[PDB]
Each structure stands twice: as C-alpha cells, then as structure tokens.
Symmetry: C3
Subunit: 337 residues, 3 copies
C-alpha cells in the first residue's frame, strides 16, 4: 500500500488495560484494514516482587510488568506513540517481534528522557508476539528489569483450529512471565538500591549465573492469586496468552489442559492438541485455548515445579459450576487402611 492509501485508512484509538486483562477487541475483524493507535508511557519505578518486600527497579511500559497486550488484526497497522518522560533516567526503545525491519522498531524508537516517538508497522503475520525494550549494549538489562510485553495479531477471520473450524473464546487473559535476578548480601538476603544505576553491576553478576531468583507472573510472586486470581466457569472457553521475553517456560494448567495450543504462538502454524504442558522458548509468546469442564481452584504454572512453587511462577483460576463425577470422582475418600 502507498502512503496515500494508508492515509485513507480508518484510525481506531485504543485504550490499553493492565494485564492480565486485555483491551476490548473483536475476534473477527470489523471492516477492512485500520491504523490502530496505542500510546504508552515508560515508567522507571520501584516495584515489590514478593511478600517479603523484595524490590526491583522496574522499567515498565505503561507502568506495568508485563507491559499491556496490544490487539490488532492481520494487515492492520499498529501505530504506537511511545513516551519516555523526563523523570526517567535512561534511554529506551521498543522492538516488536511482530514487525519487520530496524531490529523490530528499536532502531527507530530510541528515546531519551523527555522525548517521544511514533512508530507504525504493518502486522503482516497472525499470532502472539513478544515486544520489548532493547537499547544497544544494554539489552538484557532492560528486558529482565520487566521492560517487555506482547501483542496479538488475530487473523481477520478470527481464530480457527488446525483444520478450518472456528474457535471463539469467551474471555482472554495475558500472562506475562518475568525472570528477575535480584542481588543478595552475604547472609543471602536481597539487596536494596537507591537508584536503578546502583543495581546494575550486582544484577549483571546474577544474570550471568543464568539462574533467576524469582520467576513471576504479572510482576510478582502470587500476583494472580487471591482477589486477583483469574476466573472462569464450567463451559467457558478461555484463551491464555503467555509470554517470556528472555527465558524458556513450560505452561501447565493444573487440573486442566491446553485443548489447542499454538506453542510457537503463530496462528498459521496448526495448534498442538490435548496438551498437558506446552513449551514457549525465551523470546516468544504462545497461546492456549481451553474449555473448563470442572469447578474449583486451578493453578496455572511454569511446570518446572521449583520455578512454580519456590520461585513464584504460579497463578490461580477460580472456576464456578457443577462438579462432574463422570470425569473424576472420589470413590473412596482418604480413610484408614
């Protein structure tokens, strides 16, 4: 398309919402291609990542870890206004794995504090894709400080399975998984720092171990639990988009399955089916579709169970509905031998 043709396209301004929720969208595209407009302000902020009060100097798109999910359709243009407020200290940019050229957009979006930029790219391929900051020479430090998220490029005809049949979810959640590398003192307690810069050298040492101290969903140990637990009902069809910008993960819905899993995150690659645990390589997003069949509490985890249960990578679902004894029943409840 020519500059003139793109200029003639409808514009739609979208208000982003904080993960794990996703902004209003239509699964099947409404009309022809549009220029979908998003704005995000970058916040360098202290966040607490566990119940002990452990701190990270986060670098957060839209003030959240992960950054919010942007949703467009194939062949729409994504037009992002990215703002680096003067209160920040570092240059930042954005790389969209969905985009083609200039390192994903990073080469064209390097903004110092007090600056902004607008990047437009054509979303040519359907799927879920990571985005993240990547300042040359400082790439993993920004990413493992939380400066990453994902986008979803839906097919114009909405989701389908591997074999032509339409798949329509009732609700969607975005689980961003984050590996953090928090320095420890001599007694093994996590260190605190006044400025982000003070943490750099110590953090790089931990990064080099390739062993995170924390692996978390939505920015903190237990972030998606309690009154923040995800919710569903028996019969409800849920799409769970999961991203990991730096490190492998192996999602698993404990008590459920991934009925259809685009493990590679790409909708033109047919989904795996009936999955127990799927695999998303670092630097990628994946998506799983499931119809809940049983009520009760589920844990959604990275199924390295040390990562899940020691390091923080566990969320909960609360599911309403009627128990199905055909699917599972306690024939004899725990009782003396």
């Amino acid at each position: 398309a020519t500059a003139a043709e793109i200029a003639a396209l409808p514009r739609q301004k979208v208000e982003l919402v904080d993960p794990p929720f996703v902004h209003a969208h239509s699964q099947v595209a409404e009309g022809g291609p549009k220029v979908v407009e998003f704005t995000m302000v970058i916040e360098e902020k202290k966040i607490v990542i566990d119940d002990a009060g452990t701190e990270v100097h986060a670098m957060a798109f839209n003030g959240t870890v992960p950054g919010p999910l942007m949703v467009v359709h194939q062949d729409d243009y994504l037009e992002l206004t990215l703002i680096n407020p003067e209160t920040n200290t570092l240059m930042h940019n954005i790389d969209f794995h969905a985009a083609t050229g200039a390192l994903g957009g990073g080469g064209l979006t390097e903004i110092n504090p007090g600056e902004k930029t607008i990047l437009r790219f054509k979303a040519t391929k359907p799927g879920v894709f990571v985005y993240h900051c990547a300042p040359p020479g400082m790439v993993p430090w920004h990413v493992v400080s939380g400066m990453n998220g994902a986008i979803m490029v839906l097919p114009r005809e909405g989701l389908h399975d591997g074999k032509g049949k339409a798949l329509t979810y009732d609700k969607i959640y975005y689980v961003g998984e984050q590996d953090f590398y928090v320095p420890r003192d001599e007694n093994g307690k996590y260190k605190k720092y006044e400025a982000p810069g003070d943490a750099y050298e110590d953090t790089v040492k931990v990064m080099r171990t390739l062993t995170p101290t924390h692996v978390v969903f939505n920015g903190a140990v237990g972030a998606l639990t309690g009154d923040k637990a995800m919710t569903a009902a028996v019969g409800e069809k849920v799409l769970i988009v999961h991203s990991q910008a730096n490190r492998d993960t192996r999602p698993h819905l404990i008590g459920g399955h991934g009925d259809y899993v685009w493990a590679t995150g790409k909708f033109n690659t047919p989904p795996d089916v009936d999955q127990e645990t799927w695999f998303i390589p670092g630097g990628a997003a994946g998506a799983a579709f499931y119809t809940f069949q049983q009520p009760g509490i589920y844990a959604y985890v990275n199924h390295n169970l040390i990562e899940a249960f020691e390091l923080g990578a566990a969320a909960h679902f609360k599911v309403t509905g009627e128990w199905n004894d055909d699917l599972m029943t306690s024939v004899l409840a725990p009782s003396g031998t």
Copy 2:
C-alpha cells in the same frame, strides 16, 4: 455415559510391573470402555543413586523411581487405589495430568500415613501423561524426591502415523528421568539425613539453584546400562515412553532415531518424523517409535551430554541381529 451406564461398565484389575517394563496390555482396545483398576503402595525409603553411595530419601509410588506406567485406552476410566502405610511419615497424594478436575486428583487423594484412597477419572484424551505427588506447599519436594511416573492412554484403535496407517510396537519401555538435588557439606561430600524432613531445608537450597546434582533414568546412575540395558532385535519395533515431571529433557537414541516422535506426548497431535533428538518439557511425557535396523550397543541419553555422561542420564540398548553394510560400513578401519 449415564449413571447406570457407568456403573454397568466392566471392572478389570491389572497387576503392575516395575519400570522400564510395562504391564500387560493390548494396543487395540478389546470391547468398549472399561474401568481399569490399579493399586499402588507408597514407599518412603533411602535409595543409593550413584557409585559413591550418595543417598536420597525417595518417595516412591509402588516402591520405584519412577512410579510404574499405567496403560489404559481413551474413554476407559482409570481407578487407582493409593495406599500410604502407617510406617511412612509424610502425607502424599496423586495428580494425573491425564485427568480433569481437583488439580488432577491431588485435591481428592490427600492421604496421611495409615490412610488409603480410591480415585477414578475418565481418560478422555489419548497420549502419554505425567503423574506425580503434589501436596500443597511441598509440591516440588515430593516430585524431585522421585514421586512421579506416567500413564499411557492409547487410542482405542492403537497408534497410527500421520496418515492413519497402524503403528504396532513389538515392545514398549518406560524411561522415567529424575533430577535430584542432593545437599553437600562444605567439602563437597554429599550429606546423609536420618529422616526425609531433616533434609528439607538443605534440599530446597539446592533446588533453588536449578542445577541438579544428578539426572538419572530409573532412579540411579547406570540403572539402565550394563546387565540392565534394554534389549531389541534388528527389525523390532520399539516404543520408548519418556517422562520428566519437573525439568526439560532432550532424548536421543545414539546410533538410531525416533522414526515417529509424539514429542508433546499426545497422540492427536501428529508425530514428528525422522528425529535425531526430541524435546520433552518439564511436566510432560513423550513417546518415540523406532524400528531397529542395526545390531550392537546403543546409548539412549538426555542429549545435554554433560547431563548424560557426567550427571547420569544415559541408558543402553543391546540389539541382536545382522549388520547392514548398505546403511553403514567401515571402508577403511582405523590404521596408521
């Protein structure tokens, strides 16, 4: 099925067999859905896992690491009687990744020492699936103490390739791969403990490094090598089911291939073919089908070769038959 239909289904008791062997089953299901009944007793016991006398306080379904492979067909029910003898000291349960609801069954099967429980679930999806103990708040500790196994839910018409042509194996082995995290004193010598709980804090410290001290098949370094190598013959079709309940693995048959590999372990997902090394993510089982073409010793490994050859993740196959010079020949033997 309605209540009366479920109640009317045949019930069949099956006797289990320790890994890497697999209990009696038919690949093609005989008659309709059945309630297939298994019993396992949980054993807590010290096991030695290497040639230096290194001990783990194992928590073992049916007394083995891994727990035994249970085999059913799609739309059968699996009905497990799980027993926790009063001689044990810990509460245990069971989560079947094949099952739906109550965390996989764990919510319904919490048994203290001196208790038993009976869980039934409908095996709705075909594949190999992990099962493991998962007491709330102590999940990885039970799992990396060896309290995990797998099941196979065969399609009612047996296995097929991507074109629906039948794949029938002559034999099946189950390789359960276990990451262990054994504490060491400050001289690097592995520590011993009187009771499993005494090792808890020290073991969690090792677990948090995400670096196993041992990675083993069938519960110990060399358990499936030497006089305990698995066997086959040239022309024989073998299914190798492989599980890892906590940590990634990358199986490889050295000298062979995975002709068909259900890498995700799920039979409705078409198998990969002609595989050199497949990948099974932590918390899953996979299955590879191979027809042996050459006699001799094979090694079967996790192809992180440090894990295979330094940490213990190496098995052997001893294969009989006639060498095939078309496939491979020594044109010039090693010579000066």
Copy 3:
C-alpha cells in the same frame, strides 16, 4: 543396494569450506544416488573466544569450530575420510546423527594420533543433523571443546513447504552454536593452560555446574559480526542452518522472522511458519528459511538475551536494498 551396486555408483569429491559458508551444491539432486566423498583433518589448537583473550583448547574438525557443513541428498552415501594427525594428543572419532548403527559411526572411527579411517553411511533421512566426536568416557569433554558440526541431507527434489510448494534458497549459512566452560581463578580471571589434558579436571568442574561461561557462534564472541557479518539483499531467500550439539538454543532473527522453520531439523516434518523465535534442543540442528524484506543490520541471536548479549551468542546480517515504509515507518522520529 548390494556392495557391487554401491561400487558402481558415481563418486563425487567435495571440497569443504569454513563456516558459516557452505560448499557448492545443488538443491535438486543431480541424477541418481552418488557416493559423496569428504575429508577432514582433526586439529587440536588453542582458540581465543572473547576480547579478554580467554582461551579454549579446541578439538576442531577441519580446523574450525563448528566443523564444516557437509551437504548430500537423501539416499546418497556420505563417505568421510577422517584423519587424526600425529601432532594431536587424543583419540577422536565421529558420530553422525544422520547415520544408523555403531553409535552413529563412532564405534567404527576411533583413531589415535597418526591414524585415519574411512566411513561410509547411507543418508536415508532428509534434514539437518548434528555430528560430533564422542570418545567413550570423554564424550561431553570433546563436544564442549568444539568438536561438533552438522550435515544437511536434502530431499532429492529440494526443499518444500508443508503443502507441496518448492522452497529455493539463494544463500545458505551454517551457524554452529557452542557452549564453553572456561575455568576461573580466585579473582574470577579465566585460566590459561599449555596442554589440552592440563585443562581437563578444571573444565569438568565447570561443566558440572551446567552453566556455560560463554555461548558463542562460530567459536568466539563476535565471530559472525563485522568482517564476518552474514550478508543478504532485500528479496533474497536465505536458509540458516543452526546446530547445538550439547545445549538448547532459541534462535531469533532480530528485525526478521523464520518464514518456514524446520525446528526439529527434519524435512519430512512440516515446517512451522511465521516464527518469531524457534527452539532447537541440545543435540540437534534446525533450519530456518527467510526472505528479506528490509535492508539494514539484523542481529541473529539465541534469544535468551543474557546468553546473546552477555555470554556471546549474537551474530549480524548486513542487508542491502530499498527501505519499505509500508512495512515500517517512523511517523514521528525521537523528539522532545
């Protein structure tokens, strides 16, 4: 085929070239099966792997890390003459993941310094496959000393997508990714040694931590950058073969994609499409096909960004051509 039949087949001698380049070949097979002949001399040499002068005692097929890519077609015979010069200190051999029998050839190719051998195997399965040295009892040591490479067995009709469409590349590059485990002194300075055997014990200690000190393409940090950046033009179709003989990797073309990715490396397993980041388990090779659409610098990385940008797993492409503003444009350049 019979020995007589094989003896009657055309021979072709191939001259290998250093990675990331690949020797001249045809994508669509030239006539019936051939015996394709390769020769490689093994060189034990010091390599410098970072800008701090860090040394590894490499064990290098054809003098390079990785060893060179050998290209044959399905049902050709690959016939390798492998030479271990008297200037070396260790026994070496070769295992082809593409081959069947004798551990992939290692059982038939054990050569001491001053010896040579000739191995012929039938390339029965199409795809990219790792090869590596594997001396019994010293396997990971040789592999993580850089003694590994890959081969490509092309379908006789060349590459295709999952649905019968031909895929013809204009350029091919072979990226061999290497995990190294370099000992450090009390001050964290990397240690140097004056013989390969001298480094063994210290190196094994590091290997057992499962944490590489370096993760590199083509034997060193920055190797495939600057004078060695890979090149292309807008419109050009490029195949990138990637191997890792010991450890997982997750390749990613920064600024591009994997349009078709044989993630398992096996051409009879349909390629994944539109890939952002793909996954190759340790002990395997994979291949990605991409048509460049934008000019400029791309980074090709292992997308654990710590491994890419702290440990060394980053390469570049320099691509010529016209910028496409439809695909991407700066609507407002960085500004107040």
